[PDB]
Design a protein that fits this description.
It is built from 11 helices and 3 strands. The protein has about 180 residues and is mainly alpha-helical. A hairpin with a 2-residue loop joins strand 2 and strand 3. The radius of gyration is 17 Å and the shape is globular. The chain binds P-nitrophenol (2 copies). It is classed as hydrolase.
Length: about 180
């Protein structure tokens, strides 16, 4: 690796990772699963009603957005969502010990998955959690590749599953 390459891990962190996986959109859009989203992967609602999505948005931002936010607002909301994912893992008796056992880069992949899927969905992956605690990386990654999370929307999950397999940032290079 070049000097520049060895610097690339320092440029990577959970925010930079989720920003690649989720994109940045300033207007309400439907995700790969059809669901109303804004900012950096902020899910607004499962309802098919745009007006519900807008109501959730104004609540989340605190003004009358009419479906549109600023980059600064998207970042503030993203930071709240990242904090909520981290807090969700740490207060959970099933996820905390696995997270604690992980290295820094796999801890980012853990936060990413919980941000995407939520704590209860993630904490139900009994096998994957045991495999990770036992450092069975290849098996963990194959088991995550069976999930509806990955298979319903592969592009958004593929880099996270590679990161659990390798513990490096290689999947985030060369966009
Ligand atoms: O803290 N943030 O809102 C961020 C950080 C990094 C990034 O690439 C986008 C947003
Ligand atoms: O918090 N965790 O330890 C996690 C979270 C997600 C995952 O897929 C595996 C472990």
């Amino acid at each position: 690796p070049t000097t520049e390459n060895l610097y690339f891990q320092g440029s990577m962190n959970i925010f930079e990772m989720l920003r690649i996986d989720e994109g940045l959109r300033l207007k309400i859009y439907k995700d790969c699963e059809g669901y109303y989203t804004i900012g950096i992967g902020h899910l607004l609602t499962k309802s098919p009603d745009l007006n519900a999505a807008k109501s959730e948005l104004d609540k989340a931002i605190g003004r009358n957005c009419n479906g549109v936010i600023t980059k600064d607002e998207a970042e503030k909301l993203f930071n709240q969502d990242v904090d909520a994912a981290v807090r969700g893992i740490l207060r959970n008796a099933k996820l905390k010990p696995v997270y604690d056992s992980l290295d820094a880069v796999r801890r980012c992949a853990a936060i990413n998955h919980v941000f995407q899927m939520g704590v209860t969905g993630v904490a139900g992956f009994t096998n994957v959690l045991r495999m990770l605690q036992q450092k069975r990386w290849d098996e963990a990654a194959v088991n995550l590749a069976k999930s509806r999370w990955y298979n319903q929307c592969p592009d958004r999950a593929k880099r996270v599953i590679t990161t659990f397999r390798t513990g490096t940032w290689d999947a985030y290079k060369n966009l």
